[PDB]
């Protein structure tokens, strides 16, 4: 298992694992595009497989994701210059993420609400930093499908949410002060 912060490649896929609560979450790297997680009374973590360089790809996944508390099943990544953390949220637990509402985008058989938020003095790919988060949050839950990431990126940019140079992009599980499991397979 992965149980400490790291990135790398496994079976052809980039992966990232991060937590502020070492010991509360584990990630197993499965075959091909597969991984799984298990957490118990965690702080915050984000883990997943995907790509070292994000962009306008189509991301096809399916997942076991039936959380009891606060957690997200979400496309997730970063840009630099500007430094931005971004989310395309497919499902969630007790809490549906929200923020400053910008409008909607209709893609991949759903409609998503566009939100913007900001994290202050927070962990990032660039260390402790302040940075915006951009969100698309599906209006109803789903745990399999295709995400046309470009359709989100363009819609955000059309709403003045500017992305910089892409860093990593993963189909992520995120947990927060919760317990649970996920098993996610990138097609
Ligand atoms: C979004 O998710 C959690 C956290 O992002 C981590 O920042 C540290 C970096 O090394 C990891 O790769 C990221 O997953 C960020 O604070 C939050 F806003």
mmCIF file of C-alpha atoms and ligand atoms in Angstrom:
data_model
loop_
_atom_site.group_PDB
_atom_site.id
_atom_site.type_symbol
_atom_site.label_atom_id
_atom_site.label_comp_id
_atom_site.label_asym_id
_atom_site.label_seq_id
_atom_site.Cartn_x
_atom_site.Cartn_y
_atom_site.Cartn_z
ATOM 1 C CA UNK A 1 0.000 0.000 0.000
ATOM 2 C CA UNK A 2 0.836 3.659 -0.408
ATOM 3 C CA UNK A 3 0.452 5.199 3.066
ATOM 4 C CA UNK A 4 2.769 8.230 2.780
ATOM 5 C CA UNK A 5 2.831 11.285 0.424
ATOM 6 C CA UNK A 6 4.288 10.539 -3.067
ATOM 7 C CA UNK A 7 3.847 10.580 -6.874
ATOM 8 C CA UNK A 8 5.088 8.175 -9.553
ATOM 9 C CA UNK A 9 3.985 5.815 -12.261
ATOM 10 C CA UNK A 10 2.290 2.517 -11.725
ATOM 11 C CA UNK A 11 1.394 0.175 -14.567
ATOM 12 C CA UNK A 12 1.551 3.071 -17.084
ATOM 13 C CA UNK A 13 -0.465 5.602 -15.091
ATOM 14 C CA UNK A 14 0.736 8.561 -13.111
ATOM 15 C CA UNK A 15 -0.505 8.611 -9.524
ATOM 16 C CA UNK A 16 -0.431 11.060 -6.658
ATOM 17 C CA UNK A 17 -1.099 10.422 -2.964
ATOM 18 C CA UNK A 18 -1.264 13.189 -0.356
ATOM 19 C CA UNK A 19 -2.533 13.449 3.167
ATOM 20 C CA UNK A 20 -2.090 15.708 6.189
ATOM 21 C CA UNK A 21 -3.045 12.725 8.328
ATOM 22 C CA UNK A 22 -0.399 10.039 7.733
ATOM 23 C CA UNK A 23 -1.623 6.644 9.007
ATOM 24 C CA UNK A 24 -5.335 7.328 8.535
ATOM 25 C CA UNK A 25 -5.524 6.405 4.838
ATOM 26 C CA UNK A 26 -4.034 3.818 2.523
ATOM 27 C CA UNK A 27 -4.048 3.492 -1.240
ATOM 28 C CA UNK A 28 -3.587 0.286 -3.212
ATOM 29 C CA UNK A 29 -2.306 0.545 -6.756
ATOM 30 C CA UNK A 30 -4.242 -1.887 -8.952
ATOM 31 C CA UNK A 31 -3.673 -3.145 -12.520
ATOM 32 C CA UNK A 32 -3.682 -0.623 -15.370
ATOM 33 C CA UNK A 33 -5.902 2.380 -14.520
ATOM 34 C CA UNK A 34 -7.087 0.927 -11.181
ATOM 35 C CA UNK A 35 -6.553 1.990 -7.587
ATOM 36 C CA UNK A 36 -8.365 1.734 -4.290
ATOM 37 C CA UNK A 37 -8.399 3.592 -0.978
ATOM 38 C CA UNK A 38 -9.458 2.953 2.601
ATOM 39 C CA UNK A 39 -9.596 5.585 5.323
ATOM 40 C CA UNK A 40 -10.599 5.709 8.974
ATOM 41 C CA UNK A 41 -11.014 8.959 10.889
ATOM 42 C CA UNK A 42 -8.869 10.821 8.411
ATOM 43 C CA UNK A 43 -7.938 14.516 8.218
ATOM 44 C CA UNK A 44 -7.703 15.412 4.523
ATOM 45 C CA UNK A 45 -6.335 13.282 1.674
ATOM 46 C CA UNK A 46 -6.424 13.235 -2.100
ATOM 47 C CA UNK A 47 -5.260 10.153 -3.985
ATOM 48 C CA UNK A 48 -5.638 8.838 -7.511
ATOM 49 C CA UNK A 49 -4.338 7.642 -10.868
ATOM 50 C CA UNK A 50 -4.274 9.680 -14.068
ATOM 51 C CA UNK A 51 -1.663 11.724 -15.928
ATOM 52 C CA UNK A 52 1.510 13.688 -15.126
ATOM 53 C CA UNK A 53 0.323 16.383 -17.519
ATOM 54 C CA UNK A 54 -3.295 17.426 -17.612
ATOM 55 C CA UNK A 55 -5.041 18.879 -20.634
ATOM 56 C CA UNK A 56 -8.203 18.529 -22.719
ATOM 57 C CA UNK A 57 -8.494 14.780 -22.476
ATOM 58 C CA UNK A 58 -11.598 12.676 -22.176
ATOM 59 C CA UNK A 59 -11.507 10.685 -18.944
ATOM 60 C CA UNK A 60 -13.455 7.455 -18.738
ATOM 61 C CA UNK A 61 -13.909 5.878 -15.294
ATOM 62 C CA UNK A 62 -16.069 3.661 -13.124
ATOM 63 C CA UNK A 63 -16.016 3.450 -9.331
ATOM 64 C CA UNK A 64 -17.057 1.930 -6.035
ATOM 65 C CA UNK A 65 -17.816 5.044 -3.974
ATOM 66 C CA UNK A 66 -20.513 4.796 -1.311
ATOM 67 C CA UNK A 67 -19.164 7.082 1.468
ATOM 68 C CA UNK A 68 -20.863 7.503 4.851
ATOM 69 C CA UNK A 69 -19.261 10.894 5.560
ATOM 70 C CA UNK A 70 -17.562 13.765 3.682
ATOM 71 C CA UNK A 71 -15.730 12.610 0.557
ATOM 72 C CA UNK A 72 -15.505 13.348 -3.202
ATOM 73 C CA UNK A 73 -15.159 11.240 -6.326
ATOM 74 C CA UNK A 74 -13.677 13.841 -8.624
ATOM 75 C CA UNK A 75 -11.417 14.603 -11.566
ATOM 76 C CA UNK A 76 -8.680 16.703 -9.874
ATOM 77 C CA UNK A 77 -5.537 18.557 -10.862
ATOM 78 C CA UNK A 78 -3.380 21.661 -10.836
ATOM 79 C CA UNK A 79 -2.017 24.411 -13.047
ATOM 80 C CA UNK A 80 0.858 26.834 -12.479
ATOM 81 C CA UNK A 81 1.183 30.478 -13.422
ATOM 82 C CA UNK A 82 -1.512 30.869 -12.155
ATOM 83 C CA UNK A 83 -1.391 28.213 -9.410
ATOM 84 C CA UNK A 84 -4.907 26.657 -9.396
ATOM 85 C CA UNK A 85 -6.421 23.524 -7.906
ATOM 86 C CA UNK A 86 -9.377 22.243 -9.884
ATOM 87 C CA UNK A 87 -12.230 19.780 -9.518
ATOM 88 C CA UNK A 88 -14.802 18.122 -11.720
ATOM 89 C CA UNK A 89 -16.942 16.430 -9.023
ATOM 90 C CA UNK A 90 -18.931 13.319 -10.079
ATOM 91 C CA UNK A 91 -20.181 12.179 -6.670
ATOM 92 C CA UNK A 92 -19.868 13.176 -3.010
ATOM 93 C CA UNK A 93 -20.954 12.022 0.473
ATOM 94 C CA UNK A 94 -22.651 14.060 3.209
ATOM 95 C CA UNK A 95 -21.381 17.370 1.755
ATOM 96 C CA UNK A 96 -21.897 18.624 -1.820
ATOM 97 C CA UNK A 97 -19.050 21.098 -2.466
ATOM 98 C CA UNK A 98 -20.162 24.662 -3.182
ATOM 99 C CA UNK A 99 -18.632 28.064 -3.636
ATOM 100 C CA UNK A 100 -19.115 31.314 -5.492
ATOM 101 C CA UNK A 101 -21.576 30.271 -8.169
ATOM 102 C CA UNK A 102 -20.580 31.201 -11.749
ATOM 103 C CA UNK A 103 -23.132 29.346 -13.866
ATOM 104 C CA UNK A 104 -23.479 25.901 -15.394
ATOM 105 C CA UNK A 105 -21.949 23.684 -18.062
ATOM 106 C CA UNK A 106 -23.812 20.849 -19.797
ATOM 107 C CA UNK A 107 -21.539 17.997 -20.890
ATOM 108 C CA UNK A 108 -21.313 14.203 -20.813
ATOM 109 C CA UNK A 109 -25.013 13.652 -20.108
ATOM 110 C CA UNK A 110 -25.076 15.924 -17.049
ATOM 111 C CA UNK A 111 -25.212 19.549 -16.030
ATOM 112 C CA UNK A 112 -22.609 20.812 -13.547
ATOM 113 C CA UNK A 113 -22.617 23.919 -11.387
ATOM 114 C CA UNK A 114 -19.473 26.053 -11.723
ATOM 115 C CA UNK A 115 -17.985 27.338 -8.476
ATOM 116 C CA UNK A 116 -14.937 29.276 -7.448
ATOM 117 C CA UNK A 117 -13.344 29.206 -3.996
ATOM 118 C CA UNK A 118 -9.935 30.090 -2.516
ATOM 119 C CA UNK A 119 -7.577 28.252 -0.108
ATOM 120 C CA UNK A 120 -5.275 30.399 2.072
ATOM 121 C CA UNK A 121 -1.814 29.339 3.338
ATOM 122 C CA UNK A 122 -2.588 25.750 2.291
ATOM 123 C CA UNK A 123 -0.643 22.756 0.991
ATOM 124 C CA UNK A 124 -0.123 22.865 -2.808
ATOM 125 C CA UNK A 125 2.188 21.488 -5.512
ATOM 126 C CA UNK A 126 4.122 24.751 -4.877
ATOM 127 C CA UNK A 127 4.243 24.439 -1.063
ATOM 128 C CA UNK A 128 2.262 26.539 1.381
ATOM 129 C CA UNK A 129 0.403 28.980 -0.830
ATOM 130 C CA UNK A 130 -2.815 30.828 -1.394
ATOM 131 C CA UNK A 131 -4.652 29.812 -4.539
ATOM 132 C CA UNK A 132 -8.050 29.605 -6.165
ATOM 133 C CA UNK A 133 -9.951 26.376 -6.573
ATOM 134 C CA UNK A 134 -12.143 25.931 -9.677
ATOM 135 C CA UNK A 135 -15.036 23.475 -9.487
ATOM 136 C CA UNK A 136 -17.571 21.845 -11.738
ATOM 137 C CA UNK A 137 -19.989 19.926 -9.465
ATOM 138 C CA UNK A 138 -22.454 17.551 -11.106
ATOM 139 C CA UNK A 139 -26.094 18.378 -10.273
ATOM 140 C CA UNK A 140 -26.769 14.742 -9.413
ATOM 141 C CA UNK A 141 -24.384 11.953 -8.460
ATOM 142 C CA UNK A 142 -22.828 9.405 -10.755
ATOM 143 C CA UNK A 143 -20.100 6.806 -10.296
ATOM 144 C CA UNK A 144 -19.270 5.922 -13.892
ATOM 145 C CA UNK A 145 -19.042 7.834 -17.175
ATOM 146 C CA UNK A 146 -16.798 10.008 -19.338
ATOM 147 C CA UNK A 147 -15.615 13.494 -18.429
ATOM 148 C CA UNK A 148 -14.691 15.771 -21.347
ATOM 149 C CA UNK A 149 -12.283 17.889 -19.245
ATOM 150 C CA UNK A 150 -11.833 20.529 -21.971
ATOM 151 C CA UNK A 151 -15.550 21.334 -21.897
ATOM 152 C CA UNK A 152 -15.124 22.258 -18.204
ATOM 153 C CA UNK A 153 -11.834 24.143 -18.720
ATOM 154 C CA UNK A 154 -13.370 26.219 -21.552
ATOM 155 C CA UNK A 155 -16.570 26.934 -19.624
ATOM 156 C CA UNK A 156 -14.544 28.066 -16.618
ATOM 157 C CA UNK A 157 -12.351 30.294 -18.829
ATOM 158 C CA UNK A 158 -15.517 31.767 -20.442
ATOM 159 C CA UNK A 159 -16.508 32.722 -16.878
ATOM 160 C CA UNK A 160 -13.116 34.358 -16.301
ATOM 161 C CA UNK A 161 -11.597 31.463 -14.348
ATOM 162 C CA UNK A 162 -8.183 31.382 -15.983
ATOM 163 C CA UNK A 163 -6.009 28.267 -15.990
ATOM 164 C CA UNK A 164 -2.228 28.315 -16.381
ATOM 165 C CA UNK A 165 0.224 25.667 -17.464
ATOM 166 C CA UNK A 166 -1.102 22.211 -16.599
ATOM 167 C CA UNK A 167 0.522 20.052 -13.977
ATOM 168 C CA UNK A 168 -1.005 16.663 -12.979
ATOM 169 C CA UNK A 169 -4.551 15.392 -13.529
ATOM 170 C CA UNK A 170 -5.971 12.427 -11.588
ATOM 171 C CA UNK A 171 -9.367 10.734 -11.146
ATOM 172 C CA UNK A 172 -9.254 11.295 -7.446
ATOM 173 C CA UNK A 173 -10.824 10.149 -4.218
ATOM 174 C CA UNK A 174 -10.798 12.866 -1.527
ATOM 175 C CA UNK A 175 -11.843 12.289 2.062
ATOM 176 C CA UNK A 176 -12.339 14.783 4.844
ATOM 177 C CA UNK A 177 -12.793 14.036 8.555
ATOM 178 C CA UNK A 178 -14.507 10.813 7.542
ATOM 179 C CA UNK A 179 -14.104 7.043 7.132
ATOM 180 C CA UNK A 180 -14.706 5.002 3.966
ATOM 181 C CA UNK A 181 -13.399 3.235 0.895
ATOM 182 C CA UNK A 182 -13.218 3.712 -2.861
ATOM 183 C CA UNK A 183 -12.163 1.641 -5.813
ATOM 184 C CA UNK A 184 -11.745 3.543 -9.057
ATOM 185 C CA UNK A 185 -10.907 2.218 -12.545
ATOM 186 C CA UNK A 186 -9.790 4.462 -15.405
ATOM 187 C CA UNK A 187 -10.849 3.082 -18.773
HETATM 188 C C1 LIG B 1 -6.721 20.491 -2.543
HETATM 189 O O1 LIG B 1 -6.517 19.083 -2.200
HETATM 190 C C2 LIG B 1 -5.651 18.964 -1.049
HETATM 191 C C3 LIG B 1 -4.372 19.763 -1.162
HETATM 192 O O2 LIG B 1 -3.652 19.395 -2.362
HETATM 193 C C4 LIG B 1 -2.406 18.751 -2.128
HETATM 194 O O3 LIG B 1 -1.436 19.787 -1.916
HETATM 195 C C5 LIG B 1 -0.099 19.284 -1.630
HETATM 196 C C6 LIG B 1 0.406 18.616 -2.910
HETATM 197 O O4 LIG B 1 1.725 18.125 -2.621
HETATM 198 C C7 LIG B 1 -0.580 17.479 -3.328
HETATM 199 O O5 LIG B 1 -0.174 16.923 -4.573
HETATM 200 C C8 LIG B 1 -2.040 18.000 -3.417
HETATM 201 O O6 LIG B 1 -2.972 16.931 -3.634
HETATM 202 C C9 LIG B 1 -4.722 21.249 -1.236
HETATM 203 O O7 LIG B 1 -4.270 21.857 -0.003
HETATM 204 C C10 LIG B 1 -6.235 21.438 -1.423
HETATM 205 F F1 LIG B 1 -6.571 22.780 -1.660
#
